[PDB]
Design a protein around this ligand. Sequence first.
Ligand code: CLF
Ligand SMILES: [Ca+2]
Ligand SMILES: [Ca+2]
Ligand code: NA
Lengths: 476, 522, 522, 145
Amino acid sequence: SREEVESLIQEVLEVYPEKARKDRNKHLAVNDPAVTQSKKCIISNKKSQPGLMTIRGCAYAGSKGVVWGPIKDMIHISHGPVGCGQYSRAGRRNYYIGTTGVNAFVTMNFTSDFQEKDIVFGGDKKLAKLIDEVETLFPLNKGISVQSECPIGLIGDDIESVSKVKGAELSKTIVPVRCEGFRGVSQSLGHHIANDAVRDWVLGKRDEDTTFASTPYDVAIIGDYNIGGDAWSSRILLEEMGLRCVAQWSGDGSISEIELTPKVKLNLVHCYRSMNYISRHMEEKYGIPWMEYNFFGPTKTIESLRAIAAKFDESIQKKCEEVIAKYKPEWEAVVAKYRPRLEGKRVMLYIGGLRPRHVIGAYEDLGMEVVGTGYEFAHNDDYDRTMKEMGDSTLLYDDVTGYEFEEFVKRIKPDLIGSGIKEKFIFQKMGIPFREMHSWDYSGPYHGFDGFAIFARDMDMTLNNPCWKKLQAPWE
Amino acid sequence: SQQVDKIKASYPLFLDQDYKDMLAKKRDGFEEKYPQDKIDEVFQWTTTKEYQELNFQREALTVNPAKACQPLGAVLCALGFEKTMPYVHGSQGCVAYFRSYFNRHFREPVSCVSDSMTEDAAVFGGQQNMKDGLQNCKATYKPDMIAVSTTCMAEVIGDDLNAFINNSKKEGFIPDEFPVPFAHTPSFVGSHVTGWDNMFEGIARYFTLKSMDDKVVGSNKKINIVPGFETYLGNFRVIKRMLSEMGVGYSLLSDPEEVLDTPADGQFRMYAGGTTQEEMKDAPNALNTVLLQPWHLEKTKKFVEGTWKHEVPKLNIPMGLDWTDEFLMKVSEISGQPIPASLTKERGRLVDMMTDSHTWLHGKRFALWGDPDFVMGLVKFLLELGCEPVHILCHNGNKRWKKAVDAILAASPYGKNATVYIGKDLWHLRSLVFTDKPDFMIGNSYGKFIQRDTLHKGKEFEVPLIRIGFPIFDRHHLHRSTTLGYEGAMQILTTLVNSILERLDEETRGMQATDYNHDLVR
Amino acid sequence: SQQVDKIKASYPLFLDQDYKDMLAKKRDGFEEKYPQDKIDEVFQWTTTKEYQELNFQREALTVNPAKACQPLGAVLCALGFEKTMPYVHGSQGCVAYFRSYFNRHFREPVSCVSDSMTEDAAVFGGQQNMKDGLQNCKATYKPDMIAVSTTCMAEVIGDDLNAFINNSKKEGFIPDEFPVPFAHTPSFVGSHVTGWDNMFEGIARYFTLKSMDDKVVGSNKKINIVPGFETYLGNFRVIKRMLSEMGVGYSLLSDPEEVLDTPADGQFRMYAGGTTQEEMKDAPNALNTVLLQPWHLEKTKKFVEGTWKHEVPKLNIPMGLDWTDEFLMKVSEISGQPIPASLTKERGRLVDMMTDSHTWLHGKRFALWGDPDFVMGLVKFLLELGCEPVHILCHNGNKRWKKAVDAILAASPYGKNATVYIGKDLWHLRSLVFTDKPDFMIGNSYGKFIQRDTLHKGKEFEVPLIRIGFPIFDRHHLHRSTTLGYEGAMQILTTLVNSILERLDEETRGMQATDYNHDLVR
Amino acid sequence: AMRQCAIYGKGGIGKSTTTQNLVAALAEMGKKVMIVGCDPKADSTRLILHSKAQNTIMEMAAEAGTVEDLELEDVLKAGYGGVKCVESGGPEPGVGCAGRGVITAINFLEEEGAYEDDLDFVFYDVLGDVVCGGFAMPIRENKAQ
Ligand code: CLF
Ligand SMILES: [Ca+2]
Ligand SMILES: [Ca+2]
Ligand code: NA
């Protein structure tokens, strides 16, 4: 009941001091599927109020942990003190194939480990020496990135100069990234800062090179970090459809694939939030058009395959229908087995910048209803694409606070919650089935047809697990 | 493709032939990958002594460190006080990381807030963030105490915690009597354990600095116990159990055992148990104060000895037989309580276990890492077991600590092949286990990548990992274990000998090849 | 040959080339061994469904049983009484075996005597052996009680224990008041657990049959607890800890925890702790009697209900969540003591662990074996964890027990693929894990040969063993573990999920092959 | 026992001379003393050492991979009456925070074991022209009482 939700919101806000109350009220809203300009209902991408326990991360997380970290054959230096690189070492499951420590380096933590003397004198000389050491001990790395942590900009270091000098000296691509954590208000600005760094130091390397033989079916997967193998289970379908995937940005990605992307015919954007920046740039500079797609669940996947195929000739469209017919009996069997076990169950989600709206279709393919959703750092163009996907009178929350999330959950009483690691254990203690929707709870892939089977199996094992019937001691 | 009644997750899904062909094409067509023979050549070179020398002369690059930053330790320390909310003044990204890091190790909620200083605070400081932050935090989460620490951004720009908090109170953002102990915890100085020490001394000074004239040493008849950065629930527990067993009055200063282990009974408890504010105020009235991990409690020690006037005993961490004996005897001496028959019997049971397993433990070689106190305690027990601690690595260790460990080693023939390394990381350790191969590695989850690396050279070069330390993210509930006292020694001994027997069983499981030694009895 | 500074034991010594050539020549020249291709052919056939059918129709041959004989159980039961010497009337060979069997599992001394009946007693019985035996035993080992059981030889020839002991006393070989409870324990009837039941009822009747007119039910305000054949020290301990924690008066009838865990402090203690004679005499005066392993305490139950008049509660073994809850509630009901906050919190912590690990446990398939009560408790907990107990084997189980287990399974969707097998052995189980491959086996050390056999078929067919049960001879100190109560459930859950994670890590340790899923965090 | 003192004052008024003569007098009467110079000019120990300029910790630290690469021996020098002398030194002109340079140096002495249990006094000769948060750090960090 729209009234009941509006009332819930106001009740929850009562605990806040005046300033925080007025601000938070603008980030909470009752959905109206008719709205197309989300700003009329909710504001986003603003700073978080102090002391409220936001679930958000920083720009470094958005640049190092999200965009750059996954590029497998490059060495990424967490530049600054030891903290940042250690907490983010192998925490995100951006899968890849490689010989780690030899030609690939994703799971390792390279850092300049700033000590007090580095703060006093600056770390540019340390950076230069570090680079020579990286070159000596990891000769097969194909490029280096410098991910700035908070102190870099604060002490006035000039990492751009160091990168230029060492880059020319070693004939190596060295990318300075100003993703210090104090910039922006969340992981989002980190994405933008990272996209601009790729554009300015990597993307135009082959602008004058014509040795790449292109075909009219060349595409690039933009914005899929291959969580649990998500990109590979996406790539397989596109190629079965007759297309040729030249690059993957950036799950299991190589620096060469990135440098080859300007030669593709179409950029396929999955994560709009993190890579719409570089996508717009490629259209502007190379004339490459880009389109958004969704590989979550059979309905969205079939719709996406068909929309993508329509961009090419009839032969691709024919293969598209052959691929859809091949998998039809597989996902129908998944639905046949699991939908009756999940039919009608209600889910509340809270994620980053894409999935909060992107997974709705998959839940509906299993007869489930998303009664609440929100993003940690989405912008309003994200909410514009969200309201039409959510049901009337469902709850929306931007940069939700720990307190808010807990209170909304106690009132709404979802049958399942899909959020992050910092949220997981809170709700399990409340007896509410919980599934991690960032790390897929160490399961996955969830993208495509093969991913749908796993997703269904996972929602079922958790929601209907026998443990949820045992939280109350029988002598109570 | 998927078979609905046997769904495959990433492993082994991607092993299917169609996925395998697809990955081969991705590589050949767009990765411009180095030839496999070149990759083998470099990999081999990374296992050599020549590479190890180059590796050890690094001066600027750090690879796979075995330490974290200060505020992580400040948050854990704060978490051990009644209804206390850890608050880190600075950038919020840090807080998302500290929580996540502890959430994965304890598999429990971890509450902590930030005052989200952003770019516009980088120039003029975060005084406003502190005012609004403390007010919003107290109002929203209702803690009875807010313990303040800092991120590197706040440290670099010079925010004065003392002044910022005083002004927040002076201007009415939080009650003047509301406890807000604080500590500067720069990530570029020491490590996470230093943050624990800083935060603790900060809370201790907040509740006792100005009222020392009211204190009388020994008047409350208790013994204070300061645990230090501790991530094993059984360690807080075994100390309280042994003291209660002895009838010794005590006060555990920073006790997070309840809040790191709440029951799943239908409700989320943001706060639970913990050292009370009254216990901190009363602490100076104790007979004495015992520091369980002295190598990372130096600032606390100076304050406890210099201001509380406690004759802090010179005791090593209570790990292993000798050191647990010493701890009990000292506690007995300070409290006047005798060591009871039950503890004497427990000691004898650990010794029995040592006599029963010594043949499999004798001469086994180990590489190990972790925090200073934990590492030296592990080293001492290994020596007591007749094992050889060959590669001892403590990234956040120091020169005085190394000398102490070198002395412990010189006191035993089993310490002859050991070398203590400080300031070195897990990439340095990786070279050591390839050039001077030990039988096992005792360390945290990051060690799994080293095991994987050694297996690649060959099954006969594989060095299996035995998980003891922090963090442990790839196994469940090991945070419930114990490493201190006789109980912890029994657990570690059991884990070590069975790790040896498991590997031996693996190597003798070859039908008609190595199974002649696949003994039913060992 | 040997390198003095790197001595090799059988493994890998015999892998040296000269030993390998020598063994090849021994085989080719004098073993007239079946050709290797023929051996491979038969091995393969032993893993098929055709072979399994032939295997299951056996009626006379038993291969690799999963049970022992009666007197073994009588000895363990006797060991739980104060200063009591287990005495087995019959052939001495049996006693050398009973001691050795328990010595290897507990890694402790195991005292027991025999009266060495030989061929000249085979015709006329062992009356003289009993007279001299009891006298020599009492004089030499000074026990305060001698508990008598029997070997099969004495049973087959019909020696009358009652008469033999009476005559020994009548003629002065041992004092008339010296307690000599006894029990006939034929190895050809039931199994070792039946021997425990027989011995216990024998000791209970000895101290209370003739003096029941003096007893008053509930007059001593305690609850008797009969443990049954138990080989995990933590099980006796956890029951006493929970009862004391509840403030419940109790009496553990047959308590061998002290004698099976004496300290190594310079002296050998032949006897230690144990249920006292007075506790047995006073037992009828309790409020009630709870049997922890009812499926092997049927004779004891008839005596306790029929003679002591106790309304023995119908409770399953306290394993898993529901059954530990039921045990506590019943104990609360009988004693009038409420279940305290500490136990309610412990329960909630186990549930928390279950919610944290459920994703790795869900749907995991298991083959398992052991004694009846232990097997059904394991089955119940596996269901509570969302796991699938596919092959349930209890060699010494019976029809009524199977029906009970089938009912437990029918009450859960997770029990749909399970089949309960009674009277079958580990050679039968071996076929089941080849024809309907589970993910793991939960059993005792004999299961290591099945794992070895499955690996021979292929790494992908290997079924790893998880060691829980008796006996466990190839790992050290697991007898210190707990399988009962919330504590036992936490230990089993931790062991199961980490066994799953260890195997997954093994399968994803292949460099650039399967390590894409070698996750730091799980 | 050990008393931690700091001599603060404007520059150009003989503060360093007075500090070194005060220390020499204490050593003369039997006290164990250590002088830690915390002035960017690094001229707090020449009179005790009969030298033209003592190598500072900051100077040597800038040349090294890590401060622990330095050895107390090159940093700490015994002079008149056995008093021990150290010069913190400052970061290059225009770049670092002189105050943080001073704390870095003192933290190093702490870890290196320079504060013997023998010491009666430790005197920090600190600049007091502009009393900024930087030069006030020895106070904020309870380096001197
Ligand atoms: S927003 Fe890093 S964890 Fe922090 S106190 Fe500094 S070392 Fe430690 Fe983002 S870039 Fe990183 S993670 Fe923070 S620190 Fe800034
Ligand atoms: Ca938990
Ligand atoms: Ca023993
Ligand atoms: Na080389």
